[PDB]
Amino acid sequence: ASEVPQVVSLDPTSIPIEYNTPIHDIKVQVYDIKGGCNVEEGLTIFLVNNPGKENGPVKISSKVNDKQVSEFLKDENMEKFNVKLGTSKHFYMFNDNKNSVAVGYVGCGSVADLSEADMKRVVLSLVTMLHDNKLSKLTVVFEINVDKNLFRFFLETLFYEYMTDERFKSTDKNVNMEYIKHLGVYINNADTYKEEVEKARVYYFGTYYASQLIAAPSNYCNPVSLSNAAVELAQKLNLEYKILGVKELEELKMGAYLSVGKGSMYPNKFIHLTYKSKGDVKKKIALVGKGITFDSGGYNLKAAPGSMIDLMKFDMSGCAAVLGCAYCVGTLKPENVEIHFLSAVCENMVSKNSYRPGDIITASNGKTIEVGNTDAEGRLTLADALVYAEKLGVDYIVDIATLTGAMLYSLGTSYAGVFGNNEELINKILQSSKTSNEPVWWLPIINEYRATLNSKYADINQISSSVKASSIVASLFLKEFVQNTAWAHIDIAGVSWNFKARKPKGFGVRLLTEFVLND
Amino acid sequence: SEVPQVVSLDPTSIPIEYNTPIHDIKVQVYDIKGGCNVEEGLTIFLVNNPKENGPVKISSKVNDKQVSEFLKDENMEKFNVKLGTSKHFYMFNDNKNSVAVGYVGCGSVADLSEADMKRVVLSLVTMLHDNKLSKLTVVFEINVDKNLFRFFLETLFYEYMTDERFKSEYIKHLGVYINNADTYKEEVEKARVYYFGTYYASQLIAAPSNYCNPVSLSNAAVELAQKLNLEYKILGVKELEELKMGAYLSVGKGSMYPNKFIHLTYKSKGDVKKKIALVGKGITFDSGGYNLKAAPGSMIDLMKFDMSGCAAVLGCAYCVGTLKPENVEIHFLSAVCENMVSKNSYRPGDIITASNGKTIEVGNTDAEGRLTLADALVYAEKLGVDYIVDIATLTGAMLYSLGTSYAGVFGNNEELINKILQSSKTSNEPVWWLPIINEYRATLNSKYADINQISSSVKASSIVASLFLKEFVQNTAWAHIDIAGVSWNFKARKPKGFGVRLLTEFVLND
Amino acid sequence: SEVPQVVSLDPTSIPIEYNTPIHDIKVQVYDIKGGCNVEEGLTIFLVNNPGKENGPVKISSKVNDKQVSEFLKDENMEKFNVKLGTSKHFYMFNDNKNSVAVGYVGCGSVADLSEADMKRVVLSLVTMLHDNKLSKLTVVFEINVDKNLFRFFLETLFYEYMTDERFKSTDKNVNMEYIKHLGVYINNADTYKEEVEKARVYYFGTYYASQLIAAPSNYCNPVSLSNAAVELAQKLNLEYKILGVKELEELKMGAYLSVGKGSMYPNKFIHLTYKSKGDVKKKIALVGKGITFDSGGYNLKAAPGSMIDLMKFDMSGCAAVLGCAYCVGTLKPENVEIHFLSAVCENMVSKNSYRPGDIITASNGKTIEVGNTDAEGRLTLADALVYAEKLGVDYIVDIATLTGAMLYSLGTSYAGVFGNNEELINKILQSSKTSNEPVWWLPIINEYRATLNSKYADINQISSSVKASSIVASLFLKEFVQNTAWAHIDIAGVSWNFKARKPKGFGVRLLTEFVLNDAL
Amino acid sequence: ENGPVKISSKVNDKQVSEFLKDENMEKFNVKLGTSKHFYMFNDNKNSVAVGYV
Numbered sequence A: 001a002s003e004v005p006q007v008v009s010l011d012p013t014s015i016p017i018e019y020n021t022p023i024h025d026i027k028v029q030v031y032d033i034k035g036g037c038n039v040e041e042g043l044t045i046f047l048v049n050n051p052g053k054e055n056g057p058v059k060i061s062s063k064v065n066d067k068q069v070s071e072f073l074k075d076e077n078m079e080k081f082n083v084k085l086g087t088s089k090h091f092y093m094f095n096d097n098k099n100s101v102a103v104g105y106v107g108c109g110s111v112a113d114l115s116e117a118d119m120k121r122v123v124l125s126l127v128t129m130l131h132d133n134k135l136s137k138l139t140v141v142f143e144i145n146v147d148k149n150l151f152r153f154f155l156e157t158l159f160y161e162y163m164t165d166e167r168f169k170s171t172d173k174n175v176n177m178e179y180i181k182h183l184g185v186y187i188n189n190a191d192t193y194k195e196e197v198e199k200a201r202v203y204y205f206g207t208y209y210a211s212q213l214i215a216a217p218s219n220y221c222n223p224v225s226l227s228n229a230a231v232e233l234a235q236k237l238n239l240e241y242k243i244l245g246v247k248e249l250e251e252l253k254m255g256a257y258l259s260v261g262k263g264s265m266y267p268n269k270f271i272h273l274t275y276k277s278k279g280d281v282k283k284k285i286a287l288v289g290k291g292i293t294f295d296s297g298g299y300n301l302k303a304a305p306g307s308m309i310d311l312m313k314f315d316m317s318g319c320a321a322v323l324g325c326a327y328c329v330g331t332l333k334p335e336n337v338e339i340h341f342l343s344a345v346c347e348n349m350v351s352k353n354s355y356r357p358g359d360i361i362t363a364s365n366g367k368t369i370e371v372g373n374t375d376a377e378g379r380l381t382l383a384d385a386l387v388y389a390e391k392l393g394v395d396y397i398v399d400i401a402t403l404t405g406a407m408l409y410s411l412g413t414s415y416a417g418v419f420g421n422n423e424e425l426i427n428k429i430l431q432s433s434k435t436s437n438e439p440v441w442w443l444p445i446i447n448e449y450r451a452t453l454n455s456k457y458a459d460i461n462q463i464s465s466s467v468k469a470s471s472i473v474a475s476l477f478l479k480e481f482v483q484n485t486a487w488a489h490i491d492i493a494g495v496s497w498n499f500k501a502r503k504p505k506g507f508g509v510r511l512l513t514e515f516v517l518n519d
Numbered sequence B: 001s002e003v004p005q006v007v008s009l010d011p012t013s014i015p016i017e018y019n020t021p022i023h024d025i026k027v028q029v030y031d032i033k034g035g036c037n038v039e040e041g042l043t044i045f046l047v048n049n050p051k052e053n054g055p056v057k058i059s060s061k062v063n064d065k066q067v068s069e070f071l072k073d074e075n076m077e078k079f080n081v082k083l084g085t086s087k088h089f090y091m092f093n094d095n096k097n098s099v100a101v102g103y104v105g106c107g108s109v110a111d112l113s114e115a116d117m118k119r120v121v122l123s124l125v126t127m128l129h130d131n132k133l134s135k136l137t138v139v140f141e142i143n144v145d146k147n148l149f150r151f152f153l154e155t156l157f158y159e160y161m162t163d164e165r166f167k168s169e170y171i172k173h174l175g176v177y178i179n180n181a182d183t184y185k186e187e188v189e190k191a192r193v194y195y196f197g198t199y200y201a202s203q204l205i206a207a208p209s210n211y212c213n214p215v216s217l218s219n220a221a222v223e224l225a226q227k228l229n230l231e232y233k234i235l236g237v238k239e240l241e242e243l244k245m246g247a248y249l250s251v252g253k254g255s256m257y258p259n260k261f262i263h264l265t266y267k268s269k270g271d272v273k274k275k276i277a278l279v280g281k282g283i284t285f286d287s288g289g290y291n292l293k294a295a296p297g298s299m300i301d302l303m304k305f306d307m308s309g310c311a312a313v314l315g316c317a318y319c320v321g322t323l324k325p326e327n328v329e330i331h332f333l334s335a336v337c338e339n340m341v342s343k344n345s346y347r348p349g350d351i352i353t354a355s356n357g358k359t360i361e362v363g364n365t366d367a368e369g370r371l372t373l374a375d376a377l378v379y380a381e382k383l384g385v386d387y388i389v390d391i392a393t394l395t396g397a398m399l400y401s402l403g404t405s406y407a408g409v410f411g412n413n414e415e416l417i418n419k420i421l422q423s424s425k426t427s428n429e430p431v432w433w434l435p436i437i438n439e440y441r442a443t444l445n446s447k448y449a450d451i452n453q454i455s456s457s458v459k460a461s462s463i464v465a466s467l468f469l470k471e472f473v474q475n476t477a478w479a480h481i482d483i484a485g486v487s488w489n490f491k492a493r494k495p496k497g498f499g500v501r502l503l504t505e506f507v508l509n510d
Numbered sequence C: 001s002e003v004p005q006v007v008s009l010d011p012t013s014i015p016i017e018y019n020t021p022i023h024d025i026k027v028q029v030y031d032i033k034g035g036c037n038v039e040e041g042l043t044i045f046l047v048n049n050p051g052k053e054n055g056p057v058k059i060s061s062k063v064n065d066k067q068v069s070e071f072l073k074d075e076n077m078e079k080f081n082v083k084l085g086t087s088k089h090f091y092m093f094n095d096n097k098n099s100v101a102v103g104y105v106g107c108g109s110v111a112d113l114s115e116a117d118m119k120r121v122v123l124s125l126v127t128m129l130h131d132n133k134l135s136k137l138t139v140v141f142e143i144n145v146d147k148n149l150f151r152f153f154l155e156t157l158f159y160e161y162m163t164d165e166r167f168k169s170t171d172k173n174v175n176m177e178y179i180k181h182l183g184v185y186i187n188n189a190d191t192y193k194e195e196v197e198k199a200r201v202y203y204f205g206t207y208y209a210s211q212l213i214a215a216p217s218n219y220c221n222p223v224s225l226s227n228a229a230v231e232l233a234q235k236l237n238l239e240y241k242i243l244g245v246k247e248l249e250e251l252k253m254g255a256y257l258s259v260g261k262g263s264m265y266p267n268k269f270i271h272l273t274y275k276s277k278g279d280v281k282k283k284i285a286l287v288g289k290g291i292t293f294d295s296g297g298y299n300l301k302a303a304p305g306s307m308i309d310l311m312k313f314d315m316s317g318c319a320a321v322l323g324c325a326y327c328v329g330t331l332k333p334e335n336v337e338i339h340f341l342s343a344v345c346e347n348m349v350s351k352n353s354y355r356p357g358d359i360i361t362a363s364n365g366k367t368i369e370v371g372n373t374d375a376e377g378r379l380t381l382a383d384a385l386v387y388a389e390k391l392g393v394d395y396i397v398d399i400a401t402l403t404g405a406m407l408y409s410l411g412t413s414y415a416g417v418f419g420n421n422e423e424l425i426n427k428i429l430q431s432s433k434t435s436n437e438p439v440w441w442l443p444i445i446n447e448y449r450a451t452l453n454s455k456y457a458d459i460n461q462i463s464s465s466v467k468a469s470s471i472v473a474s475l476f477l478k479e480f481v482q483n484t485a486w487a488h489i490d491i492a493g494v495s496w497n498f499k500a501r502k503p504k505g506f507g508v509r510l511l512t513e514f515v516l517n518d519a520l
Numbered sequence D: 001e002n003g004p005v006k007i008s009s010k011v012n013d014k015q016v017s018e019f020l021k022d023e024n025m026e027k028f029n030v031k032l033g034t035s036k037h038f039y040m041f042n043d044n045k046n047s048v049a050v051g052y053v
C-alpha cells in the first residue's frame, strides 16, 4: 500500500468506497404464484403484458388472497388501463383486514420475450415508483415469462438503478432517501428461480463497485489510490495480490507502459490479483483492463470539439470491470480455475516529463514502437500488459478497454465490440454476453490494414496514417503482442458511460464473470 | 430521353466501352505435371516459402535448357518471396528467341487471402504495363481453390484494363500452368464475365456527374437491357407522382435533371423458385443539398461515386443476363436522381410523405440516400419478391467501423444475411454482418412527423440509417449492404466496382 | 515574498512608476469671466455650436491680448467648424511681440457631451500634445460641463497623455517631453478647483491599475503582485495581510487552491483594509479576480479566437481593487471600513494541475464538479466570497474578467452588473453615472440554476446546456453568498482597449465613487 | 426544503379523506415538479384518481 502524493493538503488520498450498501440490507423472499399473492404493507406491483395486442388492456391473472383486492383488480376494473411498455399506475384500497394497501402495475408491452433493453425500461419504470415514496417493502408479481438469466438480470438492474451514489455530496444530500428493507417476488416455479437471488446480489455489487471507481474523479482515483483500492479488495476477499512499482516495471523493461505515465505526478502501478481454486486447476485465464485514470491526450491534447476531455476519468472503466469481476469471482469462488486480474494503471498528462509525439519506445517483448499520437496511449499500456499476461502461461487472455472513440460510430452506446485471434474464445465471449445480458458484437481484425502500421524507423507504428477504422487498427496493434495464446479484446469506449443518466454502467463485470463461471 | 443541357458543350451520354482488349485475350490452362514451355512473351512464377521472406526456389520443370539454367536454385536464392516483390529478366531461349522470365513473391502463408492475391496481381500488372508483350504465362507454384483462381483472373483483367474514355498494346494470349488444370477451366470464361460486369460498373462510377446524370444513366441502363434482352421500364416524374414517391421526388427537386427510376427484370427459363429484388442507390452527384458538403474531409469532389450501388446492380444485370442462371426471377431497381442546391431544393426541416403514407421530418438534406431508398423499398416489396437486397454508399461512418476493405451488411432475416455472407466468401468481396440495434429506434421518433430521417444524438449513423430503412419493409426478408467505405480505391484513384461479383454469386448460388 | 525563478534573467518584481510626469504638472484654474491670458505654449479653446451641425467656430471668451483677440474674431474663425473631435492649430504674435500657439477642439452641436463624446474630445487634444515639445498647455472651456464631467475630462487627459515605457529598452521615444504647466479657464472656477486633485488621484489609481494589467505574466505573477500590493499598503498606511498556502489550507479554500495547483508560483491571497477614524457606519468588501495568467489549464485556450496572448489581463479585477485602494487610502473617506480582497493565482498546464472532472470542496463545505478548467475565475471567487462574508460586511462587490460572453451581450464599452440586492445594484448604477464608467444591469435568471445540478457533487462549476455563460457564472457565485447584499461586475469585455492596444484600468473610479457616495 | 406533503383542504368523501391523511401524505415530498397520483374508489364506489404536484 503506497502513499498518495499531494500538491496541497486538501488533495484526497483515497477513493471513498461504499461496501455495505442499503441493497445488502434488503431481505428478499421468493414465493410461487400458485399459492396466491398476499397483499399487505408496502407496494405490490404486477408486471403484466398483453401478447399480440399492442397497448392492450391490463388483465391480472394471479390469484390474490384477499377478497377486496381481488374485486378491485378484476377485469372490468382493469380494462381502462393498458400494457404499453413502461407505463405504470398506482392503486389504493383497503384489504380484508381493513388496512389500506398500495398496489400497482408496470406495463411490459405486447412482445412475449423481453429483450435486455425492454427489461431495463420496465425496471426504470419500477424504480420511479420507488423514488419519492418512503416504502418499507416492495412486492413484484411476475405475470410475464422470464428465464433464469433474465430474472437475475431484472434483479441486478433493479438493485443497480435503485442505488444512489452520494459519496461526493456534502451540503446537497437527499433529505428524503429511504430504501425498502424487504423485497417479495411472486413467480411461477419459484424454486427454480431462488438460486438467482444471491447471484444477482453479487453481480449487482461487482457492477456497482466498478461504477464507484469509474465515477470517482481523477483527483480521487489516481494510479496510487486505485491500486490501493485493489489491494484492499484483495484483502477482503483473500485473493493473492501484487502491485508492481516503477522500479520493478523498469526491471521488466515495460517501456511502452512506462512512457505513458512519464508526465504524471503519480507513479505507475501495475495491479496483479490472483484467484486460484483449491481443487485441480483445469483452466488458467488472464483478464486485462485498461487503467488510465485520467486521459488528457498528452501533447496530442484533447482540444478538438467533441473530444469530451471532462469525461476522461472514465478511461479506467476496463480496470474497473476487471476488479468488479474479481469481487464476483472472489465471492462466488468458482472451482477448477485460476484467474489473473491485471491492469497497467497510469495517468496521461502534459508536462516537461511527458513522452512526445514521434518518440520511439521499446515494449517488454523488445518491439520498438513509433508514437504517432500520444492520445493513443491505452494500446501502449495494454501492449506491455499483454506481454506480461502471456508470460503467465494461461489458456485465455481477455482484455477489456475503453480503447477507441470510433466505437461510437460503429456499434454506438449499447453494444461493445469484441475482436480476437481465436474463434473458440470469441464464441465463449458471445455466449457470456447472452447469459449475462451485456450485449457484445463480433468485429473483424482486418489483416489488409496491418501494413499501414509499418514504421520507416521502428519495428511498428502505434497508429495508422491512412486507415480511419481505428478500432480495427488498434486491435491489429494489440495482436502483435500476443505470440501464441488465444486472445480476445473487448472495446467498451462507447458503452461504458450512460450519457442519459450521467453515470457509469460498470459494463463488463457481469460479462467477464459469466465468462469465468461457465468455463 | 433527351438529356437537358445548359450549354451545347454539355455531354449528352455516358461513353461506354463494351468491346475491350481483355475480350481479345485467348486463355489456355495447362497442367504443371507436363512441364512448362517457355517460347514467347513473359512467364511469371507465383512462388511462396512457408522461412519468412526467404529465398525464391522454383519447383516446376521447364522444357528449355537456357531458361532452366536461369531458374537454378543458386540464381533464384538471390531473390526473396516477400509478398508482391517481383523480378523479371529478358533472355534468349533454346531457339534463340527473346523471352522474359520472372516471379512474383507470394509470402510465407499457405492460404492467400483476397487482399494478398490482389497484391500479387498488382505486381503482375505493373510488369504488364511496362512491357510490350504478345503473351503472358503464369505458373501457379502455390495452392489456390477454384474461387480464388477465378478471383485471380477477374482481378488481373480488371487491373490490367485502362479506362481512357476521357483522354484526348495488350497481350493476345494468357497461359496458365496449374495443378489439376481440368478443374479450373470452367472458371476462365466466368472470370471474363465477372470482370466485365465489374468494369462496366466502374465505367459508370468513374464517369463524372456532367456525363452521368439521372437521364443519361437511365438511358445507359436501357441500352444495356436491350443488349441482354432484359425487360426494362424507366419511370418518369409523372408516374412517380402517381405512385406518390414523395421522399424520392423531394431529393431530386433541386436538380435540373428529372428523376428517373430504373427497373430491369431477368426471368429464368423454367420454374421460378426464387424472386429477388436488387436495389441500388443512385445519386449521380451528392452535393449535400442545403446541408452542403463544406466541412473539412467531406470530399465533395468524390460524390460522383454516390451511385456506386446502382452501378453494382447494373453490373450484376450484365453478369446475370450473360450467364443466365435458372429458376430465378430478378428485378434490378434504382431510384436515380441528383442532390443539388437551388431555389427548388428541399429544405432542412421539410416534412415529406413516402409512398406508403409515412411522413418523414427531414433533419439533414445530406442524408438523401435513405429517402430515395425508402421509396425504392416500398416499390420492391410490392413486387412480391422473396428477398430484397439493397446496396448503397449510404453512411460515411462505415470508414470508421469497417474501413475501406470490408462492406457492412445489416438485415431483418438471419437466413438471408447468411446467404450474403456465403456469397462474400465465394465472390471474395469481403462483407461483415453488423447489427440493427432496436434500442436506438426511439431516436427516430419525430415530434411532428411519423418518423425522423436522422438522429440528432446517436452517432452510430450506419445503424440508425438501417433502422430507418427497415421501417419501409413490412413483411419481406431484407438485407442492406453499406458500401460507402469500400467503393472507391483511394490509392489507385478509381472505383472498385464493388458488389457486382457479390450480388451475382448471391443470385447464382440461389 | 521571494519570487521563484526558472533562470536568473526572470524578473522578481513588477516595475511600477509612482511619480509620473503627470504628477509634475502644476495645474491652475482661473475664472473665464476675467479674460484669458495667452502668453506661451499652446492655448486650446473647447468650442461647440448648438443646433447648427458642423456650425462655424466662434470664440466667446474675453482674451486679454489685442493681437490674439483680433486673430480670433468671428470673421477669421468662420472657415472652421465644430464637428466633434476636429481640431486646428494657429500661430501668431501677441502684444508682447512673442509668438504663441492657439487652437481649438470641436465639441459638436449637442450641448450635453456623453462619456464617449468627451473621450473623443480628449483624444483630439492629446493628438495636439504628442509630437510637439511644449512646456505649457492652457484649456479654455467654452462648453457646459458639470463637476463630475470636468473631473472626467482631467482624469482622461492625464491617463491618455501618459505613455508607459517601463518595458522599452532600445526603443524609448527620444522626443518624449511632457508639459510642466496646465492652465484651465472655466465659468465659476471656484467650484471646479476641488476637482483638480481628485482627478489627479483618480488618474493615478486608474493608471496604477493599468500598469499592473499591462505588465506581462513573467513580471506580474501571484508573488510579485501580492508583493506590490503590500508595498502599496505600506505607502498608504493601510492594514494588510497576505495569506499563503498553509493558511489557505487551514481555511479550507479548496476551490481557490485547486486552480493554482499547476503553477510554479504559490497562491497568494491579498487582504488590505482601510478604516476611517471614528464611527464606522458601512463595512464593505471589494473582491477582485486575480488570475495573473489564464492558459485555460487542461481546457487549453487553443480554439481560434481564444486570444491566449491577451490573458495577462485576467487579473484586471484585482488591479481595479488595488487602484481603488490607492484612491480610498489617499482621499480617506469617513464612516467606512473597506476590505480590499483578491485570491491571486495563475492557471497553468502541468503534471500538478487540476483536471476537468475533479470534484473539489469550497471553504463553505460545498463540493464542486469541475467541468472546464478554463472557468477557473468563478472557483477562486467562490472561496473569496466565502472569506468576505465571514468578515461581517454590509456589502460585497466583486469585479472580474469573468466571461467572454460579455463581448456578445454588452460589448467593449459597458460592463455588466449582476446581484442579489436591488438597492446595492442601484448604488452601482449611480456610481457608474458619477464615475462615467458605463455599466448595465443584467439579470440572474434563476430558471438556469437547474443546469448546475451535479450528479455526484453538490453543484456543477459550468452548465452543459445554457450558452448564457455570464448569467450561469453569476448563478454559480450566488451559491457562495448566504445572507449579504452582493453585486458582481463582469468586466471581461471592457477591460482591454483593443484599438489603443492597452488596458483601460476600468473599475477604479466606479468602485471609488461607490465607496465615497456610501460614506457621504 | 423538500419537506413532506400535507393536505389542508377538507374533502367531502370519507375514502379520499383517509387517503389524504397526514400519515399517508408525509411519505411524499414537495420538491418542485414531483408528483404522485393514485386510483381508488370513492364513497359511491366510483373510480377516481387523487394526487398532488
Ligand SMILES: O=C(N[C@@H](C(=O)NO)c1ccc(-c2cc(F)c(F)c(F)c2)cc1)C1CCCCC1
Pocket: A292, A295, A306, A307, A308, A311, A315, A373, A375, A376, A377, A378, A402, A403, A404, A405, A406, A408, A463, A470, A493, A494, A495, A497
Ligand atoms: O480512439 C482514439 N482515442 C481514444 C482515447 O483517447 N484512448 O485512450 C478515445 C476513447 C474514447 C473517446 C470518447 C468516448 C466517448 F464515449 C465519448 F463520448 C467521447 F466524447 C470520446 C475518444 C477517444 C484514438 C483515435 C486515433 C488517434 C488517438 C486517439
Ligand SMILES: O=C(N[C@@H](C(=O)NO)c1ccc(-c2cc(F)c(F)c(F)c2)cc1)C1CCCCC1
Pocket: B286, B297, B298, B299, B302, B306, B364, B366, B367, B368, B369, B393, B394, B395, B396, B397, B399, B454, B461, B484, B485, B486, B488
Ligand atoms: O453518412 C452521412 N452521409 C453520407 C451521405 O452523404 N449519404 O448520401 C456520406 C456518405 C459517404 C461519405 C464519404 C465516404 C467516403 F468514402 C469518403 F472518402 C468521404 F470523404 C465521405 C460521407 C457521408 C450522414 C451522417 C448522418 C448525418 C448526415 C450525413
Ligand SMILES: O=C(N[C@@H](C(=O)NO)c1ccc(-c2cc(F)c(F)c(F)c2)cc1)C1CCCCC1
Pocket: C294, C305, C306, C307, C310, C314, C372, C374, C375, C376, C377, C401, C402, C403, C404, C405, C407, C462, C469, C492, C493, C494, C496
Ligand atoms: O467565459 C468563459 N471563460 C472566460 C475565462 O477564461 N475566464 O477565466 C473568458 C474570459 C474572457 C475571454 C475573452 C475576453 C476578451 F476581451 C477577448 F478579446 C477574448 F478573445 C476572450 C474569453 C473567455 C467560459 C466559457 C464557458 C465555460 C468555459 C470558459
Ligand SMILES: [Zn+2]
Pocket: A295, A297, A374, A375, A376, A377, A378
Ligand atoms: Zn487517449
Ligand SMILES: [Zn+2]
Pocket: B286, B288, B365, B366, B367, B368, B369
Ligand atoms: Zn448525402
Ligand SMILES: [Zn+2]
Pocket: C294, C296, C373, C374, C375, C376, C377
Ligand atoms: Zn479561464
